[PDB]
Ligand binder design. Structure first.
Ligand SMILES: OC[C@H]1C[C@H](O)[C@@H](O)[C@@H](O[C@H]2O[C@H](CO)[C@@H](O)[C@H](O)[C@H]2O)[C@@H]1O
Length: 349
């Protein structure tokens, strides 16, 4: 078929599976959330907590699906239909190495639901406690072993793909051991080889040698807020792509529809980026496409705390908070606008 509706498997949407309900999880997990103290605001702050009641959730927006559980199979079905509407073929699943049966169950449910709609799943490896290249290897082995034969497990030209958040926290000399073909604990040429996509944060003077010396296959930028880092400043993307091409690296810029996290970080207002009825998203997605990249990542499907979500949101005013909403646009606007951009990306490939 040539309908302009098919999934794109070089489009990765960052997905969070940490939401709970009292009924399913024992707690409205993540809808309830601690409020972060101001890191520049002195001692003895008692910032408090958002209780995750119907009226007061840990987001500046309000989900169309309500305070949902990430383990609810019926929610997962709806999310996969949303991925189909957005044409986003890869669900890039946040992975915190919880080592608990509830995590394992949820990952299986997500893979199962994804496969029903031909969506693929890859893992976004977060900075879990004591993360290092040895336990990372062990975890990559575990994930490929447990999930690699699941029909929804993502591969690109035969290789799994992992995004590594905060990869800069680990020295290139450690990364080399895992990611150079000669490394002491290499994954190259093994059953556990993968495309490893590191998080490019700061200036080229720092990031170029890091990426090369660490033997990453590519890099992404994550932040939905333009200008938050060098990497998340879209006017740098043409030059970042030129360098990537010259050095055999895969650049996967991250685009998002906006940013606001002031319910959980009231002091962080400088990072707010207004949605302007979709115009912010359009501008950022256009820059990614114009850079001539082979793959794009979307921050985010459902990081509700950071207000970067494309998942449908609805107007809501409670006694406790007046939520933001998609304003003049309908709740599914960011899904259908993502589909539009996936089309213009495919037209460019
Ligand atoms: O996925 C990468 C990164 C993206 C966002 O900054 C957060 O999801 C962050 O997690 C931390 O901040 C969350 C609040 O937004 C908090 O709920 C988590 O517990 C933190 O680990 C992700 O690492």
């Amino acid at each position: 078929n040539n309908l302009g509706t098919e999934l794109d498997y070089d489009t990765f949407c960052f997905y969070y599976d940490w939401y709970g309900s009292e009924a399913i999880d024992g707690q409205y997990r993540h809808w309830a959330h601690a409020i972060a103290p101001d890191p520049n605001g002195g001692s003895g702050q008692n910032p408090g907590t958002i209780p995750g009641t119907q009226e007061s959730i840990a987001s500046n927006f309000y989900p169309q699906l309500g305070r949902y559980s990430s383990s609810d199979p019926n929610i997962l079905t709806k999310h996969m239909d949303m991925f189909v509407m957005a044409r986003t073929g890869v669900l890039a699943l946040t992975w915190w190495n919880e080592q608990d049966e509830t995590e394992a169950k949820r990952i299986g449910l997500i893979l199962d639901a994804a496969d029903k709609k031909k969506i693929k799943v890859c893992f976004h490896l977060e900075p879990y406690p004591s993360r290092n290249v040895q336990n990372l290897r062990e975890n990559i082995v575990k994930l490929i072993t447990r999930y690699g034969n699941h029909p929804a497990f993502y591969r690109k030209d035969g290789k799994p793909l992992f995004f590594i958040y905060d990869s800069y926290l680990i020295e290139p000399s450690e990364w080399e051991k895992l990611l150079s073909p000669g490394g002491s604990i290499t994954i190259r040429n093994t059953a556990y080889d993968a495309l490893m996509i590191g998080l490019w944060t700061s200036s080229p003077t720092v990031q170029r040698p890091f990426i090369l010396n660490a033997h990453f296959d590519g890099f992404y930028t994550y932040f939905a807020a333009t200008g938050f880092t060098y990497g998340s400043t879209p006017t740098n993307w043409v030059s970042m792509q030129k360098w990537a091409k010259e050095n055999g690296k895969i650049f996967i810029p991250s685009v998002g529809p906006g940013y606001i996290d002031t319910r959980i970080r009231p002091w962080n207002g400088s990072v707010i980026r207004t949605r302007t009825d979709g115009q912010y998203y359009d501008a950022m997605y256009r820059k990614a496409i114009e850079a001539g990249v082979s793959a794009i990542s979307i921050t985010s499907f459902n990081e509700w705390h950071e207000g970067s979500q494309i998942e449908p949101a609805v107007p809501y005013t409670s006694s406790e908070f007046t939520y933001l909403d998609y304003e003049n646009r309908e709740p599914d606007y960011y899904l259908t606008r993502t589909a539009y951009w996936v089309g213009k990306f495919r037209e460019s490939k």
